[PDB]
Amino acid sequence: GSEKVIIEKAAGDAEAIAFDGRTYMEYHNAVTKSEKALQSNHFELSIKTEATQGLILWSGKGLERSDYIALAIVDGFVQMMYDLGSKPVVLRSTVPINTNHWTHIKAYRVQREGSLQVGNEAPITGSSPLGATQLDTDGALWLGGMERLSVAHKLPKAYSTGFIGCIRDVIVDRQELHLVEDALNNPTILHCSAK
């Protein structure tokens, strides 16, 4: 006869991917092919750092020398540094991240004033000299370093030293979050340790 159709599948939910300092997640995606000109974006993601210096995120796609958004670790702290006109804004974090633990980080970027929070805590903010209140990006994203890290701009080896840790649950404006969907674009993919 028919035993109905039950839905009970729990294979766990810890999409963790370990980096080595060179892995680059090139996530090429667009929020909606039609407008392309948002006014503000949100950035969420957690990470298992294992050092102190290393760039975690970089996005752009829209110009040839403008709108530079990225997220890197320096001295043991993360910092969202972006320049869409001429002055980069490093809203670093005032909390330890090299704790080998899953930390939470975020960033509220509006026109020229951006923000950053380690677990929604003491937010570090900063804004540009309102020299560009209209940037254009396809919500593209690169997280974990950079194949062509000539984007670091002028910071120290932080970008010359990709990140080596684990990252998971990272979304921007409710986009991305498909670690393995665009990560496959890479050659090798790792998960994490201590499990």
From Swiss-Prot:
The record marks K9, A10 as: Cleavage, beta site. Disulfide bonds join C166-C192. It comes from the Eukaryota. The record marks E8 as: Critical for cleavage by neurotrypsin. Ca(2+) binds at D67, L84, Q134, D136. Residues 27-192 form the Laminin G-like domain. This released fragment is important for agrin signaling and to exert a maximal dendritic filopodia-inducing effect. All 'B' splice variants of this fragment also show an increase in the number of filopodia. This is Agrin C-terminal 22 kDa fragment. It comes from Gallus gallus (Chicken). The lineage of its organism: Eukaryota, Metazoa, Chordata, Craniata, Vertebrata. The chain holds residues 1868 to 2081 of 2081 of the full protein.
